[model samples]
Target: QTKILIIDGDKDNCQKLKGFLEEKGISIDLAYNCEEAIGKIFSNKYDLIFLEIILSDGDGWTLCKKIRNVTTCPIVYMTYINEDQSILNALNSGGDDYLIKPLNLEILYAKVKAILRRMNS
Candidate 1:
């Protein structure tokens, strides 16, 4: 099964993402903060990672860079901020994609599927 790790501070957002992905037959693991996210990323292999930018514990950009040190898996960064610099930062930090909130489930799912499929191929 394809595995996904979601690193976000909002419980409701995490649950919603988990439920949506589960309904699509995807296995998901979630972390609530940067520390937990780093732990999870180090402990397990994931096909993809969905990361939220403004985490309660710290910035997701830093986490993305840290994950890049050990993993080549795709990282999708999510943010409410629409600034170009933020998107640029994400890409520079090894993020594979940048998504702005509120995330459209259909679009997000499509992007996830496309990325994973491409990588797996």
Candidate 2:
């Protein structure tokens, strides 16, 4: 099974993503803040991560870099910011992809499938 972690301060966003992904047979984990995300990251292994840029506690770039220190799992940034600089920052910080909100379910699903296929191969 594909396990994914979603780190977003907004409960609605997390729940929305969870519902969409879960319907596709993906196991979902939720984290409302950086602290909770870190705890989950250390305690469990995830196939993929969907991270929000503006967290209530810490930023996503820092969290991505931190996660990169311990794992090679693909990190995808889910944020409202669509600026080129923010996109570049995400890549520089160890993100595999950057997705703008409100997320397009088809694109997200495609991305997950492609990344997972590549990883498995």
Candidate 3:
């Protein structure tokens, strides 16, 4: 099972994803804030991170950059921001991918699978 950390402000999304991914046999660690996410990142190595751009405690971009400075684990930004520059900025900030919410589960699964494949290879 692939281990993933999901840093999102919405607890509902965290629960939903946790249930869904766990059903698919994936292991997940959920964080409600950037600080917790960073703490977890430092504590353990995760296979991937699904991060929210706007958080209740901190911005995901800042957290993403911080994590990227240390680990090569893939960071996928979850956002409602769908501007051209925003997408480019996400990549420039060291994110490997960005997905818009309300996320389609199939698409989310596809992206996760693709990233896992790349990471393992």
Candidate 4:
């Protein structure tokens, strides 16, 4: 099964997305803080990872660096920053994609589908 790890602070939203994605047959695990995120990332082999830009325990970019050291799995960043340079920074920082906040389920699902499909092919 395809597994993904989501690292964000929003517990309530995490619950919803977990249920939503699991319905689509994607195994989802969530980390609510930076330490927990690093722990999970090191312990599990997630096919993909979703990271929020501003984490209470650490910056998203910092987390991304840690993840990069461990695995080459696709990393998609979630942020409110819509600037072009910010997108470039994300990509330059070893992120595979950048997603804006208030993530709509359908679009999120579509992006996941596209990315994973590309990996499969």
Candidate 5:
């Protein structure tokens, strides 16, 4: 089964996405802060990651860079910011994609499927 880690400060957002993704047969892991995220990232193997740009403890850009140092798993930034500069920063910081909130489930699923398929191939 494909496993995914979601690092977001909002508990409701985490649960919402978790329920949706789990329904699609994806295993979900939730991290509410940067510390927990780092711990989980090092302790387990995840097919992909959803990182919120505005985390309570730390931002996703730094986390993405840190995660990149250890693994090549795809990192998707979840942000409310629609700025082009932010998107570019995400890409440059080792993120594979970005999703703006409130998330469109269909597009999220499609992106996840496409990224996993491409990675597997």
Candidate 6:
């Protein structure tokens, strides 16, 4: 019964991920931008959150801080650029991990399970 939020301006990948995760019986909520994401964040509780680093409305780093202000749920970042700085930024700003896109379903599944598994400890 893992409920997760996938925040991304890119709808295509969001849908792809939503469907894929749902197949594993992991429920998902999709937010196209940070505004919508924050709105939902306040109303509902999520087990984990997958945030796109680059949002058209606002960057994920800023939003990450905001999300941290409310909850301590694991936040995993997704992005196109595979730079050292970006990876550091994600962790420095209170994120749990970073995943490069286009995400491989196999690896994504593995990471998701791994993160959720660690939630117990």
Q: Candidate 5 — worst ten consecutive residues by lDDT sum?
A: 54-63
Q: Candidate 2 vs candidate 3: which has greater lDDT?
A: 2
List where candidate 3 sits over 4 angstroms from the true fold: none
Give all TM-scores, in the order shown: 0.96, 0.97, 0.95, 0.94, 0.97, 0.96
Cα displacement (angstroms), candidate 5, residue 82, comes to 0.8
Q: Is candidate 5 or candidate 6 better by lDDT?
A: 5
Pairs that collide, model 3: none
What is the C-alpha local distance difference test score of candidate 6? 0.92
Q: Which stretches of candidate 4 lie over 4 Å from their true place?
A: none
Q: lDDT (0-100) at residue 111 of candidate 1?
A: 94
Better candidate by TM-score, 2 or 3: 2
Residue clash pairs of candidate 5 = none
Residues 37-59 of candidate 6: C-alpha lDDT, one tens digit per residue: 99989988999999999898999
In angstroms, the error of model 5 at 72 is 1.0
| Candidate of highest lDDT | 2
Clashes of each: 0, 0, 0, 0, 0, 0
Candidate 4 local lDDT, 1-108, one digit each (tens): 999999889887678888999999999999998899989988999889988888889888878888899999999987777889878877888899898877788898
Decide which is better by TM-score, 3 or 5.
5
Poorest stretch of ten by lDDT in candidate 6: 112-121
Query: For residues 1-121, could you state the per-residue lDDT of candidate 5 as single tens digits?
Result: 9999999998999999999999999999999988999999989999999999987788889989999988889999888999999999999999889999998989999999999999999
lDDT of 6 at 118: 86
Error of 2 at 73 (Å): 0.3
The better candidate by lDDT, 1 or 4, is 1
- Candidates 4 and 5 compared by TM-score, better number: 5
Off by over 4 Å in 2: none
TM-score of 3: 0.95
